[PDB]
């Protein structure tokens, strides 16, 4: 894992739960996909859970996210591939970052992910 | 032939039947199937019986050369394809039996698709004047029908 | 220079978007030309297309060629290279070349090629 913005190892099952969580969020509620859109979501505080791809390059476009999010105290999780992240988000192209602003049909799932990520770090 | 031109056939709400190599007129078969399409099965059977009995003319919209009109509104060229009606009535009864044995209710069946195609041509010759032998051919017809139970 | 590269890429995009489909005369009239669309030079003595009259289709000319610096490049700007196995996958330049897996390669070898290209950081135009 490149060390610029990776902080902790996210297990494969946790990544899969995050992927299906963002899938259900897109299906039912509302999400905000894209790096700039995610950054604005967290800066304004409308987001609840943020998901970051592990295959972003160059790194200067997504590196600032966890430093800027630890200020707002919002849960962030990692996923393996931006390709799969975008596919889950519903766009053919890759999605470096995603923010969920209302986890419709996913309140309990987001709570579980938040608890696990808080325990990890 | 074996296949059907219908796309979304399912064995729960539909029933199908066919006839191949019928010594009837494909043009009149097409004209009759045009009116038979989108009708209840019993109503279509009654319509075919009327056509056979010569009580109701079948309109012609595509192949109507040198055809006289008929009494009533919408006529216009019309005729009485008795042979075609008799041939297609058997297919209609066959599809009714298919639906009944499948478990559908005959009184609620609607003809949602019915089509006619030109089949193989049987060849022969007729002698003409000045030593010319000329084609003399029988055109066969394929008929396909699938009905659905409305609910 | 990336600046000239981008300018010429835009120029080629505009030119090839305005370029027409060069088809032989009366291609529409007969099915024998519709099913097999090509361009053939009109050579008849009275051919209006040969005479090059307004209101008639145009004919290919050397002027329509795209700028040299970006001729034959992918719309993304990379350079296509046809690949049939990992050996020739490895011989590309990730900063200036992209791999197109040959249509005749099976899935068994294609998955290997894709994972190797991911390891080597080489763009693939048809990643499946």
């Amino acid at each position: 894992a490149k060390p610029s913005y990776v902080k902790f190892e996210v297990p494969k099952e946790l990544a899969e739960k995050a992927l299906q969580a963002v899938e259900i969020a897109r299906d039912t509620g509302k999400i905000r996909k894209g790096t700039n859109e995610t950054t604005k979501a967290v800066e304004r505080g409308q987001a609840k859970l943020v998901i970051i791809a592990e295959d972003v390059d160059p790194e200067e476009i997504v590196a600032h996210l966890p430093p800027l999010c630890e200020e707002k105290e919002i849960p962030y999780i990692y996923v393996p591939s931006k390709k799969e992240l975008g596919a889950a988000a519903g766009i053919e192209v890759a999605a470096a970052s995603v923010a969920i602003i209302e986890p419709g049909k996913a309140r309990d799932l987001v709570e579980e992910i938040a608890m696990k990520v808080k325990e990890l770090m | 032939r074996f296949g059907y031109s219908f796309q979304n056939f399912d064995p729960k709400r539909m029933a199908r039947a066919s006839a191949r190599d019928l010594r009837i007129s494909p043009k009149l078969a097409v004209e009759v199937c045009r009116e038979l399409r989108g009708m209840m099965l019993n109503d279509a059977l009654r319509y075919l019986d009327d056509v056979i009995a010569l009580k109701r003319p079948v309109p012609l919209k595509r192949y109507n050369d040198s055809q006289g009109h008929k009494p009533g509104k919408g006529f216009g060229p019309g005729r009485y394809p008795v042979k075609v009606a008799k041939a297609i009535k058997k297919v209609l009864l066959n599809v009714k039996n298919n639906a009944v044995q499948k478990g559908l209710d005959p009184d609620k069946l609607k003809i949602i698709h019915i089509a006619a195609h030109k089949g193989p041509v049987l060849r022969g010759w007729y002698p003409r004047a000045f030593g010319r032998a000329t084609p003399f051919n029988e055109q066969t017809t394929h008929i396909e029908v699938v009905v659905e139970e409305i609910r | 220079d990336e600046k000239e590269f981008k300018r010429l890429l835009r120029v080629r995009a505009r030119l090839k978007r305005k370029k027409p489909r060069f088809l032989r005369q009366e291609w529409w009239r007969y099915p024998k030309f519709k099913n097999d669309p090509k361009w053939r030079r009109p050579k008849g003595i009275d051919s209006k297309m040969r005479l090059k009259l307004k209101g008639k289709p145009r004919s290919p000319s050397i002027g329509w060629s795209s700028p040299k610096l970006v001729r034959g490049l992918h719309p993304s700007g990379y350079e296509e290279v046809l690949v049939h196995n990992v050996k020739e996958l490895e011989a590309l330049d990730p900063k200036r070349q992209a791999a197109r897996i040959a249509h005749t390669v099976g899935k068994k070898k294609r998955i290997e090629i894709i994972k190797r290209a991911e390891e080597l950081g080489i763009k693939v135009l048809n990643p499946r």
Partner: protein, 92 residues
């Protein structure tokens, strides 16, 4: 812009074979002396004991292909390399 695509060593014959590509859009084919100077400067090779076997340009592509050799000592060159190549290089 020279990029090395392959380096091979053969001590049995006592030399190093270098396969590379020069990316020169908008520029002519680089001179042999310039290519040798750039390659020697980058690889820290000995200028007196290296030869450029060939430089090739293929159609409109600005990617020319170069093959070169670098020997440990002049004895191996005087034993292997032909006189015409030595004269062309000018190192003899």
């Amino acid at each position: 812009e020279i990029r090395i695509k392959e380096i091979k060593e053969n001590k049995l014959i006592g030399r190093k074979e270098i396969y590379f590509e020069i990316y020169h859009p908008g520029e002519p084919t680089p001179s042999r002396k310039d290519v040798k100077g750039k390659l020697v400067a980058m690889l820290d090779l000995n200028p007196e004991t290296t030869v450029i076997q060939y430089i090739r340009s293929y159609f409109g592509s600005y990617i020319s292909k170069g093959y070169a050799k670098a020997y440990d000592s002049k004895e191996r060159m005087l034993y292997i390399e032909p006189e015409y190549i030595l004269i062309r290089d000018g190192l003899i």
